[PDB]
Ligand binder design. Structure first.
Ligand SMILES: [Mg+2]
Ligand SMILES: [Mg+2]
Ligand SMILES: [Mg+2]
Ligand SMILES: [Mg+2]
Ligand SMILES: [Mg+2]
Ligand SMILES: [Mg+2]
Ligand SMILES: [Mg+2]
Ligand SMILES: [Mg+2]
Ligand SMILES: [Mg+2]
Ligand SMILES: [Mg+2]
Ligand SMILES: [Mg+2]
Ligand SMILES: [Zn+2]
Lengths: 135, 97, 99, 220, 57
RNA sequence: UGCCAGCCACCGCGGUCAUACGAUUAACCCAAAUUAAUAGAUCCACGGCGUAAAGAGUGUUUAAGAAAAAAAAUCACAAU
């Protein structure tokens, strides 16, 4: 008949060696195509064991220095008056304007926080955005 | 040499830890008013954490304080002192519905 | 060629950071009697209850002003391996796409 | 007979034979919402190496890896479609059921989107008919069923010696699927994307079949 | 033998294979070694392996 | 014959139709030996210790051992 054991190995293994003994006398289609283009990993059964002890994930949380600025933008003024759209691919809000004003003020050689912040804030008061200034 | 990668930075968006109503205050057993607020009006009972909503430290200090104000004779055991019934209301208990 | 992280970086969702109390613009793809299913575009749709204010205006194709509360609704419960997702997000209806 | 073995052994020697490379890009999948996962609470443990990073608690899939896999996926799908074999789209997702069914009928391909009767693949002859031929390729638009378990047909196909191509999400268990594509099964532009990508892969495959068959008929 | 962390040295073979034989002059042998250092390392290794072979022979 | 007379190394067999008893008949296996009884040879744990036999009511030390780097910080406050 065949091998219905889901655990034992990848379908490639089961099939290939099944044929190999002469039990299955008809090669399936998918076996030949699979010989042509093997996928990244062999689909072998693995047991979803939970982690114990000091073992933690390998994920790297995602952060940039831009965010270290956006943190202070939000800290002062709040979310931008332009609202947001995740529909528009290239969209950039008030916060992005603030980030790039602060970047171009950073290459200017000002190491101080208040200078960069307030002068990128006037740099924004020039372009026509309204910074509410929440307490 | 890809400069768009992530930074191994600490969380900038990290919020401030919330604080008990007494967080970095100080409690003495010599103010019976303060201790009154955390006590039940009709009973003279001491509200649990789920009502007062204080950290462990501040709750324990509140309690030790209530006891110490009671046996020395600063505060009555069996009721809230009438004077303080009309004070500000901290707790989440609604008795009357 | 644009590296993927490069695309991630300037994308309007990253510029937002935390979704908390955010101002978002969204669009309604589906309607039930009182209930508007609103895609603001993040991942999950959120859901809203049609207001007494201009009830008949919010419709199919209608755009709305959302106040985003949570990006997606999830929490862990007693003796669970993994959490439980609602397949929704939390948002409030402020007004309709003021123009 | 000899030239049948010709017509079949020909497309295997050119990796691009259907030219699917042009159907999409990293940008394509990016505006398709594909890169978004569930929370890092809900994450699967076998979804770590396909993942990119955790942005404020919400996971992000790696779209370069996604592109690499999905390439092989549509490659394979087309390759069985040319070789004249059955394809069944499974999903338990009620949002997109109609979309998928419409995709299936329009590919001239089969879809089960509905309650999955337990012994369908395991016990075919009693369920479907006295003797029956079985799907050569299954395609999952979700690896889940509405109770958030691995969908039966994963296990069943795996048992039935059938390859499988599906979209895993941050919370799915990939290990028993033949060709996974890491991506977003939850958001609508995503499923529309995947629907049409698989659809076109199929249409191209069957077309090439008609034409190379016409070639075979002219050669004599 | 299972217990022990290098049980292959409690083998009878490992005792007859290790080769040093001592002259008829040698009677007492002292091994003075140190616990903590990376400079006593190979010595402790000499204790933990070879002393078995020496002694057996 | 009928829980009787008996039988068995272990399980067990006999209460009216016993392939287990006594006696036939066929067979099987040893063979100038064959069975019974008693001792040996062999046979535990380099296994284990929540629920099965097994972590002593607690702590310290003597003997006797074992060892890379970290191995003293504080009550969220009810030791004696
Ligand atoms: Mg009698
Ligand atoms: Mg008789
Ligand atoms: Mg007998
Ligand atoms: Mg007899
Ligand atoms: Mg033994
Ligand atoms: Mg045990
Ligand atoms: Mg005993
Ligand atoms: Mg004990
Ligand atoms: Mg003792
Ligand atoms: Mg006792
Ligand atoms: Mg040690
Ligand atoms: Zn506090």
């Amino acid at each position: 008949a065949g091998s219905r054991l889901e655990t034992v190995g990848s379908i490639f293994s089961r099939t290939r060696d099944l044929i190999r003994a002469g039990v299955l006398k008809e090669k399936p289609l998918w076996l030949d195509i699979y010989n042509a283009f093997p996928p990244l990993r062999e689909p072998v059964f693995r047991r979803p064991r939970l982690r114990y002890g000091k073992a933690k994930a390998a994920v790297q949380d995602i952060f940039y220095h831009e965010d270290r600025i956006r943190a202070k933008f939000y800290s002062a003024y709040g979310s931008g008056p332009k609202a947001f759209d995740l529909f528009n691919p290239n969209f950039k809000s008030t916060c992005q304007r603030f980030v790039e004003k602060y970047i171009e003020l950073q290459r200017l050689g000002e190491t101080d926080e208040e200078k960069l912040f307030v002068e990128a804030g006037k740099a924004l008061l020039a372009e026509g955005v309204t910074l509410r200034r929440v307490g | 040499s890809n400069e768009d990668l992530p930074v191994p930075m600490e969380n900038p968006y990290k919020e401030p830890l919330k604080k008990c109503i007494l967080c970095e205050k100080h409690v003495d057993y010599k103010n019976v008013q303060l201790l009154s607020q955390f006590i039940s009006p009709f009973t003279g009972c001491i509200y649990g954490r789920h009502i007062t909503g204080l950290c462990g430290k501040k709750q324990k200090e509140i309690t030790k304080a209530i006891k110490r104000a009671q046996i020395l004779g600063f505060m009555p055991v069996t009721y809230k002192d009438p004077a303080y019934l009309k004070d500000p209301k901290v707790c989440n208990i609604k008795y009357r519905e | 060629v644009e590296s993927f992280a490069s695309m991630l970086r300037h994308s309007p969702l990253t510029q937002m950071g935390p979704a908390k109390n955010k101002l978002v613009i969204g669009q309604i793809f589906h309607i039930v009697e009182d209930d508007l299913y609103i895609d603001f575009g993040g991942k999950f749709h959120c859901v809203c209850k049609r207001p007494e204010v201009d009830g008949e205006k919010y419709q199919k194709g209608t755009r709305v002003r959302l106040r985003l509360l949570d990006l997606e609704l999830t929490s862990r419960f007693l003796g669970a391996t993994t959490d439980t997702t609602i397949l929704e997000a939390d948002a409030v209806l402020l007004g309709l796409q003021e123009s | 007979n000899d030239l049948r073995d010709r017509i079949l052994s020909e497309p295997l020697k050119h990796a691009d034979f259907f030219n699917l490379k042009e159907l999409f890009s990293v940008r394509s999948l990016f505006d398709a919402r594909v890169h978004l996962g569930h929370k890092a609470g809900c994450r699967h443990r076998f979804m770590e190496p396909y993942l990119f990073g955790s942005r404020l608690g919400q996971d992000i899939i790696d779209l370069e890896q996604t592109a690499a896999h999905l390439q092989l996926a549509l490659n394979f799908t087309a390759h069985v479609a040319y070789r004249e074999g059955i394809i069944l789209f499974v999903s338990r997702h009620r949002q997109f059921a109609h979309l998928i069914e419409t995709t299936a009928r329009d590919c001239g391909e089969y879809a089960h989107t509905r309650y999955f009767k337990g012994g369908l693949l395991t016990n075919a002859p009693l369920l479907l008919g006295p003797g029956v031929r079985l799907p050569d390729l299954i395609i999952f638009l979700h690896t889940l069923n509405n109770v958030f378990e691995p969908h039966v047909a994963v296990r069943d196909a795996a048992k039935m010696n059938i390859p499988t191509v599906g979209i895993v999400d941050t919370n799915c268990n990939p290990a028993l699927i033949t060709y996974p594509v890491p991506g977003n099964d939850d958001s609508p532009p995503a499923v529309r994307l995947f629907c049409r990508l698989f659809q076109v892969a199929i249409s191209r495959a069957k077309e090439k079949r008609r034409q190379v068959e016409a070639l075979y008929r002219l050669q004599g | 033998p299972m217990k022990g962390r290098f049980p292959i040295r409690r083998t009878l073979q490992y005792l007859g294979q290790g080769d040093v034989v001592f002259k008829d002059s040698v009677k007492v042998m002292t091994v003075n070694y140190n616990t903590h250092g990376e400079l006593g390392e190979g010595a402790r290794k000499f204790v933990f392996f070879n002393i078995p072979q020496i002694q057996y022979k």
